[PDB]
Design a protein around this nucleic acid. Sequence first.
RNA 1: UUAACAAAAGUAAAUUCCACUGAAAUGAAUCAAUCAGAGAAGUGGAAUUUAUUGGCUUUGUAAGAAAUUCAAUG
Length: 100
Amino acid sequence: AKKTQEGVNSKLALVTKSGKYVLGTKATLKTIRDGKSKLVIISSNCPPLERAKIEYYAVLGKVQVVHYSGSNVDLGTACGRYFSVSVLSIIDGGDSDILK
RNA sequence: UUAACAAAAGUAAAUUCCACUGAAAUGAAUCAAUCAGAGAAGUGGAAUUUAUUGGCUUUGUAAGAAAUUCAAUG
């Protein structure tokens, strides 16, 4: 009933194709501050301090928070990128079904 | 030729931070390295160090001193 990250992992590949996402932690907070964020993904090794800042913003902004299983390196690869992504915002998912 | 201590016309090198923005066709850089979505490069700023104030030229001290000449103190 675990290792579901052939879903969200596969889902976070159509977003690279058709959707729009914002990578990073400081860039995520801007989306939550506006109404442009519909989903937030936090890696497993995000520091506990400002991880708690993102879920506090997300509660205030009424956004859904997804706790990714892998590290910021694993999340970055899942986006097809060659750096590490610790926190992700799904502004819009074109043909994927994460926002469902 | 110019001191301690102070001043702030003009103008430096290096490092670390801040704001805007968000990098992949990956870029930035050193003699070497090294660094970046826990955020690079760019632009604009803040701070500290550089034999006292604030590093260097400059200024007050201060030319009245001192050095090199001349005349018989100037």
